[PDB]
């Protein structure tokens, strides 16, 4: 696949310039998030002899191994006047002692490690990823408890803080190792994390565990006790028995953690056939010029495929039928993959073609990759008479029931029911990533504006009043602004709707790491519902 | 069990009066919610020949059969200036053709059936209940689409509107029948519900199904077409083929639905031993005097048990060990149940006793019932030294892994980690009910006030400034008000944190209906994690 | 089946007289064993307020229900100068709360409840029966620990005392309830029994539980403490937590035990077809005249069958082939049973016929009943040339692999490999019973005498010395005496080689109770080895 | 102790979860004896280890490098708990209790009994009672006595321990490791 783009063309020059600016904007914002709470907080953190949260991860994972961080932008401008870099927690997948593990570390420099509502959601998302892929969970615990001013959004509900311990208990029952490293204070619910873990490590003086903190003890019983005496490594290690390993400092604890993982008696086994890896035949950075930042212009999704698959080799399925959808077989880093990507408006033929393809991949146990660039479904009286809804529902049912690993990448718009058919967040893809130029909402901003314009114009006629052109613009403008703001990738990523915003040049690497992690779990047989013929 | 209370005692007289007022308040508010959109909206609905949503359910279920409605108070004062009685949707469990089914009906009189964020959550909770208990789902579809002003909280995320179709596909693959009755208009995503169902019924003229509504068709292609022509029963029944059954009116559609359920070829089989039912030996209304509305006063939970179990017969387990927790075996409507109830503060012995009991019930496949009236965990230096956290975590791990049906009833306070240990919402109990006097939050309102008072008092001393008694009161007052508002049952029930607020006199009936429904699914073997001894 | 015997015949008169004497001898000996330790020990036992061991069982089981005691003669003359009636323990199967349970009660009147080597073996056999038939185990614990003078035969080996706790843990993991009722002192290993049980009941003052007794505590630490303070119901019930229920006296403890069994949530299910029961057409007491006590005389096994099966109905299989063996289908108390019984010396045809029949019963999941009256295998040069050993092995291989319930009843001789072929003790029949006239040994007493006579006579000739007829008698006499003493039913039953000596008139009742208990466990599919054709 | 039993019970669950073979090195001297320990359920704690060890389905090999007495034998995978192999060093001793404990226990019992009868049990009387008991436990606790009967799979030179364990574990791995199902943990 693939063709050489016209580098001299004005369109390519403009598209490259716009996409490059977005990538540069993404990079510098991450740099700021990298600093966490700030210089004063970081200086205080180091002054206590503790490692910085990201330095802990660097020392924990194997030397030189890549680290796949998730939801870097959680909490970005989420709260009106509070800055919460990364949500106060760092989550990602890295290799420890040759085993892929999920690492969940509290960032004590951010609000003292307090749990904001987004912090709980980010952790719960990480646990969901670990369970679905059978990845051992390592908790670098340094937390300050729940954020009381927003308790109603943290404590009570099913997907609130309580679910964290539920996930730990369930994974333990499935032999998915749960390892907790107490490198700081943990209070109230925090003390449960080391207690609920299969194996536990606590640092000599930094680590403190207690159901009730000293402040509560004094209020309840009028006794003054230091945190170390109430908790501490020595009390739990030698008297309470809550501690399984005793560590001198942060470096020692991380060394102990690597030893614990090495004793898991786990070896990775692959269910899929493997072939030698090959680089794509075209540079990845050309995606800047090809795609650009203007969603109104259209590009051939095959060009994107040609620059991420091994050797740019692609076997297209039903090429001339339902051409607005592209489906075919390829390989990424040696793994077999079935790719489904939008190339226009969805039609009845496209939905049928997709439904047929998904059955093929499920039968052969082939992982599925979705490339969402949607603009809606075909609109027309004839199409509805022919059951476009019936056809669109066919793809949704098939995608939902598929048990092969599924990864979704939003390289463009994601609107309406087209999102569901292309394995949206609601359909439990193993991972979901978005490019910096993506837009997501119930419908496109323009459609909502135009729909309101028609509705109001007709309503004015019914009342007999007149809606002028200036009246039309006044109505449209606030709607377009709202959808542009709420469909922005940062808005979507600040809340945990996706697992991160990724540079297009990094698409192949991210997919390779993600599929490799997803293969830690055996692929199950797919059971389908009734196909409404 | 049970003793005759002192009706003449002032405490009983006061407690009865206070609880009676709460029940009267609950009843009259439900009466207002019963009216839906209002007289003008109700009159318009009937003028179109359509049955009112609650009349539809009455004609659907078997004559005289009880109907267990869920989350009646969803959306109660949830939105600042918009009244959304019941969330715009009615959900509950009833008997159709001798089969227990989950019924999900849109309330077209409420905002024209539009989907508010709470409406999506209520529907997803109903689908979760049906899936866990293998209850066939019946959708009485009459909807106006998503509520655009709040699209960001409806469309995108995993637990947003898209999840509705995912649940239908999964339930269908497991042979949990999905039946859709299109009794009105369904547009955009709504059109998918009839398409995703195993069997579908549409009314002659009220029912309309189309992926794109007439307003979008005109904007996209500049064509004017009526909703009936674009959708309509005739188009889908005869040409599109989306409709499986064609109904003349609402009564005919409901009659056809009962026939469809009768052809499911399903017969209920019980996995548990059964004994003849017996009424409790004490009146249920005495619970008013015994419990009251003051959470600071304490009562013996055995009194509550004596008035809901068959014959007031109860075999207590480990009665004299960890006496702050009550565990034992009983029978409700002939079903075997293990009851865990709070009778004070949780201790290490209580948690150990509870963990032992849960293993017994799981081994014998006995359903579990939790009665939460908590006031926290024991606070003390010695208790932490003896691993109270290690003990509390033991109960949490056992409760999470238990695979027997679990029902939780909050008859009092629900604070902190005590909520988790007693099968809170985060631990997936089949049902969760609360009495009108309940309170739930991360911690008691007073504790948060006292904790802040101590923190500010010490902080002022460190700064050298003085915090006066009037200063203490000024700080405490706003916190106590906040926790009172957010811990109120109506606050907890307006959002879907529980499945309903129930009159204490109705406790036995509600539990009997819930356990009967939960027994439709076979009980699986329980796999536990590592017990940190 | 069956014919009316000639009551006037001298043979019948002699046989009835001899068999009647054996039954009378059996009855009176059991009467003595019924008294346990004796009047002085019994008076002391009652003086402490404790119930007698057999009165406890009477109060435990359902009113009027039959009780199937096992190994009544264990320890009968086993030890030179010590009388240990019943081995110091009473075991049997009875109905508690409508559930068939295995009851294991220590007899404190016998040697203060010490564990003799036979006591451990009898208990282990009882546990083995419960595990194979999935019968809940009830331990009425009143014991004095191991008998030190014989510790080498109690403590160390796999089938020694330690195996008792291993059986409890394994049965618990399979959901076979273990219930311990501490109605007295339990020390050292005994204290583990209540600890290993799923649910435990201890009497207020009689019950004492302690790993180390007061005598060891004083020696180790020089402290004087009473048994009640060291153990006792109050300490364990309220402080140690070892006790799950607290009982005022023996009657209360037994009442509580019945409640515990009723909460097991167990219902018996039958895998076999059932038909209405019918009494045999001939009196059972006629078996006395038919069989007698002289093993040299032969009788028709069909006469025995005619007097134990429902309606004396029997469908013989391969009647005219291998006539020395009788096999056919019958019903006992409505249960289907395949019967295999000896009718003479085993031949090649008989073994082949038996092997064919066993496969038929295993295929249809029909219980097997073996009636052993053997006299050896056919001896001849031709028979060996035709592979009689190859044929005899076939039956042994088939019988061992059969997974249907098997019950063995020795109504006569049991010698050599014929014992193995007819489901001897080594082949794990669910139960094994012997009539009072039976004899079991490696070979018949006469054969051993004659073999030695031939060997010695030839050896004398080789040496040239002469072995006279008087020399022959001197050699034979001690051998015949030895085989008579060690082949006696009381010798076999004193050690636990069988589950009891039963009156022939009680054969039908014992078989009915045994087969009924054996049906509590589901029948598994049978996997056979290679049939050496 | 109570802590030791809890620690052992936790460890056995970890090995069973990960399907890791278990090796037991028995050198026991008994359980802690005290009024407080019984009040805290030492028996309840000791039973926990016994229940876990019995249900474990991973291969188990036991090596007695010293004393093996009383319920401590059961807790450390004695012969009754079906270890795949059981070996003993030439210096080992196994019996229901230590020879001295049986002697001292009888000395205390007889001394009290003599006082109840009013008769006197002298120091020479104490020695006469103790001596036969100590001799009996020495002969029946000897490794050769234990190995003459099949209570163990052999007496091995301590220098050969690594080789014997390597051969034994290698053979035990011919069968697939099954999942472990536990009973109720009396917490």
DSSP sequence for C157-182: STTSTHHHHHHHHHHHHTT--EEEEE
Q: How far is Cα A203 from Cα A207, in angstroms, rounded to an integer?
A: 5
> In D27-185, which ranges are continuous DSSP H helix?
35-39, 42-55, 70-75, 99-117, 123-140, 143-148, 161-172
Residue found by looking up tokens 């398409």 in the block: B195
3-state secondary structure of C49: coil
> CA-CA distance, D35 to C218, in Å (whole number)?
10
Kindly list the partner chains of chain D, i.e. chains with 3 or more CB atom pairs below 8 Å. Answer: A, B, C
By Cβ distance, the residue of D7, D17, D184 closest to B363 is D184
Looking at chain B, after which residues does the C atom sit over 2.5 Å from the next written N, breaking the chain? none
Q: How many Å apart are CA B366 and CA B315, to the nearest integer?
A: 14
Cα separation, D173 vs A245, whole angstroms: 30
**Phi, psi (degrees; rounded to nearest 5) at A89:** -150, 145
Q: Is the dihedral of CA A484, A489, A491, A496 positive or negative?
A: positive
Cβ-contact D16, B529 below 8 angstroms: no
Contact exists between C and B (3 or more beta carbon pairs < 8 Å): yes
Closest residue, chain D, to A265 (C-alpha): D18
A111 CB neighbour count, 10 Å cutoff: 19
- Which residues, 6 or more positions from A252, have their beta carbon under 8 angstroms from its beta carbon? A203
Q: B313 to chain A nearest CA, in Å?
A: 33
If residue B291 lies in a helix (H) or strand (E), which one and from where to where? helix B287-291
CB-CB under 8 Å, D151 with C172: no
Q: Neighbouring chains of B at 3+ CB pairs within 8 Å?
A: A, C, D
What is the enclosing helix (H) or strand (E) of B203? strand B199-203
Nearest CA distance, B351 vs chain C (angstrom): 12
CA angle D48, D51, D55 (to 5 degrees): 140
DSSP labels, C105-153: EE-TTTGGG-B-HHHHHHHHHHHHHHHHHT--EEEEE----B-GGGGGG
Among D82, D69, D61, D89, CA closest to D170: D61
Yes or no: say if A100 and A135 are a contact pair by the CB < 8 Å rule. Answer: yes
Is B530 in Cβ contact with D13 (below 8 Å)? yes
> How far does B429 lie from chain A, in Å, by closest CA?
10
Angle between helices C214-221 and D99-117 (to 10 degrees): 110
From the list C237, C241, C263, the residue facing B315 with the nearest CB is C263
Q: How far apart are the first and last CA of chain D?
A: 16
Is A100's Cβ below 8 Å from some Cβ in B?
no
Does D47 reach chain C within 8 Å, measured CB to CB? yes
Taking the Cβ of residue D57 and every Cβ of chain A, the question of whether any pair is shorter than 8 Å is answered with no
Measure CB to CB from residue C265 to each of B317, B319, B365 and give the nearest one. B365
Residues in chain D: 187
Distance of CA B532 to the CA centre of its chain: 32
DSSP 8-state symbol, B51: P
Rounded Cα distance between B316 and B322, Å, is 12
Give the nearest chain C residue to D184 (CA atoms): C198
The alpha-carbon gap from A49 to the nearest alpha carbon of chain B, in Å, equals: 24
Give the DSSP H or E segment for C364: helix C348-364
- The answer to whether the CB atoms of B419 and A210 lie below 8 A apart is no
d(CA B410, CA B422): 10
Of B356, B363, B530, the CB nearest to D187: B356
Residue D160: Cβ-neighbour burial (10 angstroms; 0-12, 13-18, 19+) = exposed
Buried b / exposed e over A23-49, threshold 16 CB at 10 Å, is beebeeebeebeebbeeebbeebeeee
**Chain A residues close to D173, C-beta within 8 Å:** none
Instruction: Decide if A198 touches D, using CB distance below 8 A.
Output: yes
D55 in contact with chain C, both atoms CB, cutoff 8 A: yes
Residues of A with CB below 8 A from D20's CB? Answer: 265
Report in angstroms the alpha-carbon separations of B235 from A393, A394, B244, B357, C276.
18, 19, 12, 59, 63
D17 touching B (Cβ < 8 Å): yes
Q: Crossing angle of helices B162-173/B117-133, nearest 10°?
A: 10
* DSSP secondary structure code for residue B427 in this structure: G
**Cβ–Cβ gap D185/B360 under 8 Å:** no
Q: Report which of A389, C351, C276, D33 is spatially closest to residue B187, judged by C-alpha positions.
A: A389
Resolution to 1 decimal, in Å? 4.2
CA–CA dist C324, C373 (Å, integer):
11
d(CA A354, CA A531): 13
Contact D185 B352 (CB under 8 A): no
Among D71, D105, D183, the residue with its CB nearest the CB of C169 is D183
Phi and psi dihedrals of D34, rounded to 5?
180, 150
Question: Is the pair A, C in contact (3+ CB pairs within 8 Å)?
Answer: no
Cα distances (angstroms) measured from residue B84 to each of B109, B111, B485, C110: 10, 7, 20, 79
Please give the Cα distance from B122 to B139 (Å, whole number): 13
Chain-chain contact of B387 with A527 (C-beta, under 8 angstroms): no
- Residue C198 burial (10 A CB sphere; 0-12, 13-18, 19+): buried
What is the spatial distance between Cα C376 and Cα B373, in angstroms, rounded to a whole number? Answer: 75
Q: Quote the CA–CA distance of C134 and C102 in Å, as a whole number.
A: 9
The answer to whether the CB of A238 falls within 8 A of the CB of A76 is no
| H or E element, residue D31 | none
Distance CA B254, CA B4 (A): 48
Closest CA in chain D for residue C193: D47
Sign of CA dihedral D77, D81, D85, D86: positive
The distance of Cα D139 from the centroid of its chain, to the nearest Å, equals 18
Determine contact, residues B95/B57, Cβ cutoff 8 Å. no
Q: Locate C379 and state its tokens.
A: 């001896």
Among C175, C241, C266, select the one facing B321 at the smallest CB separation: C241
Under 8 Å CB-to-CB from C47, ≥6 apart: which residues? Answer: none
The answer to whether the beta carbons of residues B418 and B346 sit under 8 Å apart is yes
Q: Report yes or no: B530 at the D interface, CB cutoff 8 Å.
A: yes
The 3-state DSSP composition of chain B as helix, strand, coil percent (nearest 5) reads 45, 15, 40
Distance CA B306, CA B339 (A): 12
CA-based nearest distance A208→chain D, Å: 21
Structure tokens at A458: 């007709």
Beta bridge partners of A102: A93, A137
Q: How far is CA C209 from CA C52, C144, C145, C392, in A?
A: 20, 11, 12, 53
Chain B environment of D48 (Cβ under 8 Å): 533
């Amino acid at each position: 696949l693939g063709t050489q783009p016209d580098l001299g063309s004005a369109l390519y020059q403009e598209n490259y310039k716009q996409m490059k600016a977005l990538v540069n904007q993404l990079h510098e914002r991450v740099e700021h998030i990298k600093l966490g709470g700030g210089e004063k907080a970081r200086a205080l953190h180091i002054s206590r002899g503790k490692l910085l949260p990201r330095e802990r991860i660097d020392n924990l994972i194997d030397p030189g191994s890549p680290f796949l961080e998730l939801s870097q932008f959680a909490g970005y401008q989420l709260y009106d006047n509070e800055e919460v870099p990364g949500g106060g927690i760092i989550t990602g997948i890295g290799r420890v002692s040759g085993v892929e593990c999920m690492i969940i570390a509290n960032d004590a420099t951010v609000k003292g490690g307090a749990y904001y509502p987004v912090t709980v959601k980010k952790q719960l998302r990480a646990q969901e990823i670990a369970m679905q892929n059978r990845l051992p969970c390592i908790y670098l615990v340094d937390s300050g408890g729940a954020y009381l001013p927003r308790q109603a959004d943290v404590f009570p509900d099913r997907d609130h803080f309580g679910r964290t311990f539920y996930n730990q208990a369930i994974m333990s029952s499935k032999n998915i190792a749960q390892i907790a490293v107490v490198m700081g204070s943990c209070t109230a619910g925090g003390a449960y994390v080391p207690a609920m873990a299969d194996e536990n490590i606590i640092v000599r003086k930094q680590g403190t565990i207690f159901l009730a903190g000293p402040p509560l003890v004094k209020a309840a019983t009028g006794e003054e006790v230091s945190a170390e005496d109430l908790g501490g490594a020595d009390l739990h290690c030698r008297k309470s028995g809550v501690s399984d390993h005793w560590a001198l400092d942060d470096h020692h604890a991380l060394h102990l953690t690597r030893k614990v993982v090495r004793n898991l008696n786990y070896q990775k086994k692959l269910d899929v056939t493997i072939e030698p890896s090959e680089e794509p035949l075209f540079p990845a950075d050309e995606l800047y010029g090809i795609v650009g930042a203007n969603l109104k212009r259209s590009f051939d999704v095959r060009e994107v495929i040609a620059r991420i698959v091994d050797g740019s080799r692609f076997t297209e399925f039903k090429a001339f039928y339902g051409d607005t959808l592209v489906t075919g077989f390829a390989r990424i880093f040696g793994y077999p993959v079935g790719i489904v990507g939008n190339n226009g408006v969805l039609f009845s033929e496209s939905a049928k073609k997709g439904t047929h393809f998904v059955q093929l991949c499920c039968q052969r146990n082939i992982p599925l990759l979705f490339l969402q660039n949607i603009t809606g479904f075909m609109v027309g009286r004839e199409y509805e008479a022919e059951g476009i809804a019936k056809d669109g529902a066919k793809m949704v049912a098939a995608v939902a029931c598929a048990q092969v690993p599924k990864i979704t990448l939003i390289i463009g718009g994601s609107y309406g029911a087209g999102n569901y058919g292309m394995c949206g967040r609601a359909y439990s893809p193993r991972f979901l990533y978005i490019w910096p130029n993506a837009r997501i909402s119930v419908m496109g901003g323009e459609q909502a504006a135009n729909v309101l314009a028609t509705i109001t114009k007709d309503q004015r006629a019914r009342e007999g009043k007149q809606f002028s052109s200036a009246d039309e613009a006044a109505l449209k403008e606030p709607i377009i602004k709202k959808f542009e703001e709420e469909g922005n990738p940062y808005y979507s990523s600040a809340r945990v709707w996706d697992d991160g915003i990724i540079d297009p040049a990094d698409t192949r690497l991210v997919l390779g790491l993600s599929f490799s992690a997803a293969l830690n779990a055996p692929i199950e047989k797919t059971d389908f519902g009734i196909f409404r013929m």
